Curated annotation (Swiss-Prot):
Belongs to the plant thionin (TC 1.C.44) family. Disulfide bonds join 2-39, 3-31, 15-25. One of its GO terms (cellular component) is extracellular region. It comes from Crambe hispanica subsp. abyssinica (Abyssinian kale). Gene3D superfamilies: Thionin-like. The lineage of its organism: Eukaryota, Viridiplantae, Streptophyta, Embryophyta, Tracheophyta. Pfam families: Thionin (PF00321). GO terms for biological process: defense response. This is Crambin. The keyword Kinase does not apply. The function of this hydrophobic plant seed protein is not known.
Length: 45
């Protein structure tokens, strides 16, 4: 998980709680996921 801060990180984590694919949770909140373990610099939080 790579969000721009606690705001998104909290949202994407609140949208996948029910049954949403992090994609729809990081697309609506902005955060973004990546097939690895190194987040970007704008979403390194």
């Amino acid at each position: 998980t790579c969000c721009p801060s606690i705001v998104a990180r909290s949202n994407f984590n609140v949208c996948r709680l029910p049954g949403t694919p992090e994609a729809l949770c990081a697309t609506y909140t902005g955060c973004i996921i990546i097939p690895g373990a190194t987040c970007p610099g704008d979403y390194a939080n």
